[PDB]
Amino acid sequence: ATLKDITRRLKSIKNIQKITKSMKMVAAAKYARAERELKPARVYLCGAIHSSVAKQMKLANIIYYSLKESTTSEQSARMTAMDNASKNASEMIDKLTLTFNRTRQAVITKELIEIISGAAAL
Amino acid sequence: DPAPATTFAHLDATTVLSRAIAELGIYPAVDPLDSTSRIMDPNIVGSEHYDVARGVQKILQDYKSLQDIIAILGMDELSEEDKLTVSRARKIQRFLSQPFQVAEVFTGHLGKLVPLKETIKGFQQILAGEYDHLPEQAFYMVGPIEEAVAKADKLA
Amino acid sequence: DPAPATTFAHLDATTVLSRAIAELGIYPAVDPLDSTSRIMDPNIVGSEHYDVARGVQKILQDYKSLQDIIAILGMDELSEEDKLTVSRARKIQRFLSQPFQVAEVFTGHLGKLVPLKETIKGFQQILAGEYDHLPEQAFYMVGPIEEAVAKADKLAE
Amino acid sequence: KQVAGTMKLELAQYREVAAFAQFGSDLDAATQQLLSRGVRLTELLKQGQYSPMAIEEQVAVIYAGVRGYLDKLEPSKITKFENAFLSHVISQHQALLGKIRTDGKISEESDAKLKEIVTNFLAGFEA
């Protein structure tokens, strides 16, 4: 392990957590708008949206419908995906900080004991 | 770290002052959910005190959760229940502030030394819903709960 | 480390090499963000030189910061302008490498010596957008910018 | 004190959303304005070496951004604006700089005269 390593990972993963955190809320807003417009329609990093449709996949009437269902779904999915990803980043930050502080303490101790052993051997 | 961890062996409580809390104008800047205490035990501070303390703590924790939706996702689709959690929580959070006798000379306001009995009653009543008909500012920088109602009337 | 650390103050200019940069095949493995010079002042090496140099460090530091993020979140989240600076940062990174006469036994390339002006010009042109159309690998291990355009051509099929 | 308190408040809000900046493809006008002020202010915080400025020049430049005058100016230009603007006030507006000093703070008059200078200067700059 290395304090250099942890410190950088920590800096990156802390930015990832905030960024992803923001996306969660953005999607969330889009999801709200999209759901309001989903009312009238039925009277006629997106989680796993893309994968589902593409796997099962391989006028104007339906088009609008799908599109409306699509946007709602995607934003719900994305919201969920980013919410979870920022949570995962949070836990990983906490865990990395713990490792950082164990290493920081072992390093202090280890350097000091070298100094004492050298001193004492005189 | 060996220093703080050795210290904590002897602590019976912690008082946390926060720049954030401060900035909300809540004085003292005591963080209500960070500050902890060992004697905060039913068998020690009594069951009443305990239930009200926890009750305030939870209302605050819930509010925190809800806040994400409130300002961002629009504070409108809030269930009858959620509407009150937010309103009471904000009053309680404001009622947690208090004029100190020490600041008197600067704030030009009598400091209020509030008796444990008064404290328990107040927060108990706000959790209850008895004061759900007063403006927030009425619970801001007061002492005894009575003074909260009094300010309300004066503010209208 | 105490040895290298205490040496710094004794210098007027420092060129700091990095194993990480060497590992990528960028030679010389100079760290553009950790090499300094007392004379790097507009009043000495001049304005054009000074601005270009700071302009290169900046785009390189910007990139360095997006790296770790976009490696997880995917580059698709980058806006056109951002993915534009990312493209030129990598080109600049490669144009910073150079075949050494002394290193021919290792690079398998003919050493190259680039005069100050040419260095300034080329980098200034990359910063300015003038070579957004050449692939990165054209800038890898060449001398003057002109060779970057040649190599770009060279890549036919 | 006056101008500093505002800039510090705005930079702190900026530091909060700062990360979302380069990834906020579709950000709401609320946080979008926070990013714009923040960059502007950050730019005004840059200063070349060997040229320490007087307190009144400091407050005048901070004023420009903290008052939103440079919100629509492109961030890359801010530095250029600052030097030209400051040279102008040091040249033609010594009285204003004097007032800001002597009067202790930014009076209603000074604030009014600053409005006219920045807005007109900016327009010529973007011309």
Please answer whether residues B118 and B144 qualify as being in contact, where contact means their C-beta atoms are separated by less than 8 angstroms. yes
Give B69-136 as a 3 state SS string.
Answer: HHHHCCCCCCCHHHHHHHHHHHHHHHHCCCCCCCCHHHHCCCCCCCCHHHHHHHHHHHHHCCCCCCCH
Does the distance separating the beta carbons of D23 and A23 come in below 8 Å?
Answer: yes
CB half-sphere exposure, D63, CA atoms < 13 A: 25
Cα(D98)–Cα(A49) distance, integer angstroms: 65
- For residue C36, list its beta bridge partners: C14
- Phi-psi category of C129—alpha, beta or left, where left has phi over 0 and alpha has psi -120 to 50? left
Place of tokens 């770790």: C68
Q: How far is C77 from chain D (nearest CA, A)?
A: 6
**Ligand-binding site membership of D49 (annotated):** yes
Q: After which residues is chain A broken (C to N over 2.5 A)?
A: 44, 58
Q: Closest to A19 (Cβ–Cβ): which among D23, D26, D28?
A: D23
- Give the residue on A whose Cα is nearest the Cα of C67: A12
DSSP count for chain C of H helices, then E strands: 7, 2
Please answer whether residues D35 and D4 qualify as being in contact, where contact means their C-beta atoms are separated by less than 8 angstroms. no
Task: Please tell me whether the peptide bond between B4 and the residue prior to it is cis, using omega within 30 degrees of 0.
Answer: no
- For residue B37, list its beta bridge partners: B13
D partners (3+ CB pairs within 8 A) are A, C
Joined together, the tokens standing for residue D47 give 């200063």
Which of D15, D16, D17, D20 is the best mutation test for A, with the most CBs of A within 10 A? D20
Please answer whether residues D66 and D55 qualify as being in contact, where contact means their C-beta atoms are separated by less than 8 angstroms. no
Coil, strand or helix at B12: coil
**Cα separations in angstroms, D121 against A99, C88, C123, D85:** 55, 34, 34, 7
Contacts of A96 (CB under 8 A, 6+ apart): A6, A9, A10, A13
User: What residues of chain A lie within 8 A of the CB of D30, using their CB?
Assistant: none
Q: How far is D37 from chain A (nearest CA, A)?
A: 19
From the candidate CATH numbers 1.10.357.140, 1.20.150.20, 3.40.50.150, 3.20.20.70, the one assigned to the domain spanning D1-127: 1.20.150.20
Does the distance separating the beta carbons of A18 and D19 come in below 8 Å?
Answer: yes
Cα(B47)–Cα(D8) distance, integer angstroms: 46
Q: How far is D10 from chain A (nearest CA, A)?
A: 19
Backbone angles phi, psi at B58, to 5 degrees: -70, -40
Which of A11, A13, A23, A26 is the best mutation test for D, with the most CBs of D within 10 A? A26
- For residue B14, list its beta bridge partners: B36
Backbone angles phi, psi at C110, to 5 degrees: -80, 125
CB half-sphere exposure, C111, CA atoms < 13 A: 8
Specify the DSSP element, H or E, that contains C14: strand C13-14
Place of tokens 């007027």: C12
Backbone angles phi, psi at D67, to 5 degrees: -95, 5
Q: Closest to D26 (Cβ–Cβ): which among A15, A18, A26?
A: A26
User: What residues of chain C lie within 8 A of the CB of D49, using their CB?
Assistant: 41
**Cα separations in angstroms, B128 against B40, B84, B93, B121, D57:** 21, 11, 15, 10, 57
**Ligand-binding site membership of D33 (annotated):** no
Does the distance separating the beta carbons of C77 and A15 come in below 8 Å?
Answer: no
A partners (3+ CB pairs within 8 A) are B, C, D
Coil, strand or helix at A64: helix
Specify the DSSP element, H or E, that contains B36: strand B36-37
Q: How far is C115 from chain A (nearest CA, A)?
A: 37
Specify the DSSP element, H or E, that contains D122: helix D108-125
Backbone angles phi, psi at B13, to 5 degrees: 180, 165
Joined together, the tokens standing for residue A4 give 């250099």
Does the distance separating the beta carbons of A15 and C69 come in below 8 Å?
Answer: yes
Residue B4 touches chain A, beta carbons under 8 Å: no
Does the distance separating the beta carbons of A12 and C69 come in below 8 Å?
Answer: yes
Which D residues 24-43 touch A at CB under 8 Å? 24, 26-28
Cα(B14)–Cα(B12) distance, integer angstroms: 7
Does the distance separating the beta carbons of C79 and D22 come in below 8 Å?
Answer: yes
Handedness of CA A18, A20, A26, A29 (dihedral sign): negative
Q: What is the resolution of this structure in A?
A: 2.5
Range A30-55 burial, b when 16+ CB lie within 10 A, else e? bbbebeeebeeeeeebbbebeeeeee
Range A71-110 burial, b when 16+ CB lie within 10 A, else e? bbbbbbbbbbbbbebbeebeebbeebeeebeeeeeeeeee
Q: Give alpha helix (H) positions in C8-144.
A: 19-23, 47-73, 80-95, 104-107, 116-127
Cα(A95)–Cα(D43) distance, integer angstroms: 36
Nearest CA among B91, B6, A12, D24 for reference residue C66: A12
Which of C54, C77, C81 is the best mutation test for D, with the most CBs of D within 10 A? C77
Q: How far is D49 from chain C (nearest CA, A)?
A: 10
- For residue C30, list its beta bridge partners: C17
Domain spans in chain D, listed from the N-terminal domain onward: 1-127
Q: Chain A to chain B, count of Cβ pairs less than 8 Å apart?
A: 12
Cα(C122)–Cα(C114) distance, integer angstroms: 10
